[PDB]
Design a binder for this molecule. Sequence first.
Ligand SMILES: O=c1ccn([C@@H]2O[C@H](COP(=O)(O)O)[C@@H](O)[C@H]2O)c(=O)[nH]1
Ligand SMILES: O=c1ccn([C@@H]2O[C@H](COP(=O)(O)O)[C@@H](O)[C@H]2O)c(=O)[nH]1
Ligand SMILES: [Zn+2]
Ligand SMILES: [Zn+2]
Ligand SMILES: [Zn+2]
Ligand SMILES: [Zn+2]
Lengths: 549, 549
Amino acid sequence: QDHVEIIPLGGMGEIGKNITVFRFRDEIFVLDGGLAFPEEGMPGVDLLIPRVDYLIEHRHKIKAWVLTHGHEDHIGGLPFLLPMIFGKESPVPIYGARLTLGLLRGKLEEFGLRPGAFNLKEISPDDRIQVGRYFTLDLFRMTHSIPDNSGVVIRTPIGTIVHTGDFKLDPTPIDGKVSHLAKVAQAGAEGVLLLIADATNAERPGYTPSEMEIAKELDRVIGRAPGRVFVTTFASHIHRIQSVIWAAEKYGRKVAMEGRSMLKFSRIALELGYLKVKDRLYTLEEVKDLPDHQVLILATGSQGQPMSVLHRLAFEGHAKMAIKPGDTVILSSSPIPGNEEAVNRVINRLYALGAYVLYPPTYKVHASGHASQEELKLILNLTTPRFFLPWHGEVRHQMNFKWLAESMSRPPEKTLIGENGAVYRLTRETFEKVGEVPHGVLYVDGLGVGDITEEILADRRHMAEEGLVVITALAGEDPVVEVVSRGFVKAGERLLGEVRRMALEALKNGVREKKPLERIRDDIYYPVKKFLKKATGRDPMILPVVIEG
Amino acid sequence: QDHVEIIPLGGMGEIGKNITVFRFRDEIFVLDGGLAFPEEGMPGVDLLIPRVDYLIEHRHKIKAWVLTHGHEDHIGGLPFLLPMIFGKESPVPIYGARLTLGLLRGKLEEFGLRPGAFNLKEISPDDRIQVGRYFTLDLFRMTHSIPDNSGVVIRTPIGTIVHTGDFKLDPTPIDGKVSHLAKVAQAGAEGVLLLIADATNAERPGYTPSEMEIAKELDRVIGRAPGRVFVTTFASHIHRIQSVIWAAEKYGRKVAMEGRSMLKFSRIALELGYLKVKDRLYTLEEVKDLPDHQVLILATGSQGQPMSVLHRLAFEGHAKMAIKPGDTVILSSSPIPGNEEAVNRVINRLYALGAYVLYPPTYKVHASGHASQEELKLILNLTTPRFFLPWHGEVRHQMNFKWLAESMSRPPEKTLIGENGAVYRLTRETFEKVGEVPHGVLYVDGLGVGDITEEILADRRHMAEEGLVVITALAGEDPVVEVVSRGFVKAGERLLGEVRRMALEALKNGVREKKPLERIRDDIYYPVKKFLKKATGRDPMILPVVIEG
Ligand SMILES: O=c1ccn([C@@H]2O[C@H](COP(=O)(O)O)[C@@H](O)[C@H]2O)c(=O)[nH]1
Ligand SMILES: O=c1ccn([C@@H]2O[C@H](COP(=O)(O)O)[C@@H](O)[C@H]2O)c(=O)[nH]1
Ligand SMILES: [Zn+2]
Ligand SMILES: [Zn+2]
Ligand SMILES: [Zn+2]
Ligand SMILES: [Zn+2]
């Protein structure tokens, strides 16, 4: 009769804004609460966060919030999500490792969220915590692109759920902290009911290169740089940042840092001992008049991602720095899903500015923080789950992980492709989607959350693809109709006179018939809509503005 | 004193719409005239063609048009370009190999362009032709993704220009026709003044896989397909089409073909003997009630590219066919530059529809038709040019080819990164950009060329990114102002009342001052523009519609 309910609100069928709800009877615990960065073409938007209607409604049932690591797509939404769910304070335990909470506290500060306003509980990446009456969570350290990263064995009343968390099996991590697989292998031997695993590189054969390999390559290309060196990466990629710092130090270069979020995350990492710097980190101004060959700039965008700073350096221009011939620019991160070709344009432009650009995959200046097939198969054989739920990847990633699992010695009884908002029921003998709950995203820009909406976005697309047709109609005894367009096909642009004309007949009949301005609007809208369709095969946005006299 | 002028009008700093003008004194010859396929997000547009203002102006100076191969980005623009330059007929020699001209004639037919309306001169892929008094062109066969493909040694009064054309050095081509390098090596020993070479895969190490490797892999994955098989590729990829046909035949599958352009190109290839089919090619209807395992569908979009058919199969739906669980879909081509992540979405959706999708680079079901670094270095050492002009690739490709050349035994004296519209002057001792000429693109949709413009496109983007603010103003003794918006930030949406108000003051002052409706429009536009900027940091499109009384 007993069953666990798994409800993803973000992170399924996508890479970003991870948050997964677990529930047994009337006790809930949440795993992460990340944000997702926006794709280009969606200007204005700073970040996306998952809709948590379900948690707001069941807020009093949440017994704890568990955070796996400090990447923005795992804790970036919290400064927004917490207030939405609990208000400006809460007693609910929010567990996380030292670095993870250090970064979280840093973010909360920025939102005026008091320190102890929330109950942050610092734990070990390998800790064991009891959540309410029904959940015993056994965390285990996993190598990833940030220190203090964990997976978790979720022990429930009906069996074990092994959650790999974000991971790769780096044999030689920069901080010397290898993955701890004892709890995972142990659970495998005892019997794993459900496995939830990182599908990011499920389509990639072999093993993901070690962060140390990148460190060595960065060392090489940097020691080869004739003048200045610019390195872009995510602010939360502490391992990469350390690799860069070591490179800069070895060749006598002072490290300057640009990007609010990275200076912040880096300061915190230094205070807590996760980062070490021979000298100290400097600002752009402090290295202003340094010889080109003794300067290395670590930069990212205001929100933590490299895109915005790369784009400004290449196009609109940056107020604090400018690219010049001879400069070496290294993109030490992969593009946000959807920005791949936006990055290529940036690269093209950086080259045209005279810089020597090194970027992946052409140049080995970056390595994924996720496991490739050999690492995934190892985890699959370690756990031999009865049920499988690929996560942290789009449908193709999830599907390729499913195919990978199906080719193992003891394939899972059943594998499901998880979706955001879906409700999965897990029993000792079954696993199935049994419903859905309100889900989605909320858009965030400077002017707060929601300033941008799905509707606003929908109109922008209808606009961007079909154009606009504005019909100005004066409803009086001497009716007037003017039609103008923009971004509309020239062919249709020559049919506006016919538009104006049919709008006039509608306007006159509307008046003569004492109709309300709204039904007159409809009377104009629908006919012109159909006409331009049956005439140009286009669906421009038709804005009928009907004004009395 | 003598010098050759090279003027690219398309194909430089991009992959697509290739056309290059060569000139000595008053005699011109043109190399190709392709089109470029559109990126998604640029809906409505069917194809892009290069602006040929320069050739229209100097039309009487053109002594011949030379076509290297039948790929759309080399001959696809001709049905549009020829009429624009010569009218509906011309005596000017248009040289091309058998297949190349066969496909060209097929295209011209579709535009009502009479057969002999133009002077198509069929030549051998290894021919030698004299162009006017100053040019002797020595063509040489090069393996590529279509039969009858050539590079060309352009012999001029001041030296030799070796143009590689599109190529890879496939050691085992499907048609058994290997590359002919005798003319290239010969020119290298005599001394090559300028080398123009294919930079597509200049950033890729090693050698491009042979089309035969793909043929074998396609054979494997197809023989593994439980039910129907769908294969998408460009209509002009005759080698790939043959590879697929052989696969289908070996496993007793009848081949159906969808996509006007591919049925057409394939018929022509069959008539001319470039394609061989055990049985015959069928239509969708003819294979309607065939067992799933005995059906293979070769498809592409109406214009020759796979995108539109893949998109319909995955989203909006196709009238002639539908994807069903168990179907195997193979994307046997790479995405158009800018469609990479549009393809990923299609793949995700195809998987969600229940099909087994195989696509590159995850699956080896496709191989580039362009040379990788080892093939390029071979060509570089074969020619050892004094001057170098990488072509057929974006800036990063061009730059990486430049770096590759600079690492050779005898680097070029100087390498230039070519641009469309730039004018390069070549003498025996020099090579330099000395000017520019009107250049660009023209957008083409069903309603003909130009139906879509840069302006229309610009407004669509301004619209798509910033939204819209329509201010309706009635200029009379009882002024009226109404403001409405769409795709505009909620924050700004709350400032429309303030907009209306400042528009009213402008409207009233405009009236009271007898100003013309245009200066009143400006008086409303500019202030509101600045206001919303200084208030929301956004630049929405402001459409002030001022109407008398
Ligand atoms: O905080 C982060 C760090 C990385 N990524 C993205 O996750 C994907 C995998 O990163 P990786 O394989 O390069 O480590 C990429 O699309 C990258 O842009 C994020 O969305 N958020
Ligand atoms: O007629 C064609 C054939 C291929 N391509 C494109 O050329 C690039 C290289 O193709 P390939 O390396 O896969 O052969 C790709 O972006 C592909 O979409 C075209 O633009 N036109
Ligand atoms: Zn992560
Ligand atoms: Zn993650
Ligand atoms: Zn080609
Ligand atoms: Zn080409």
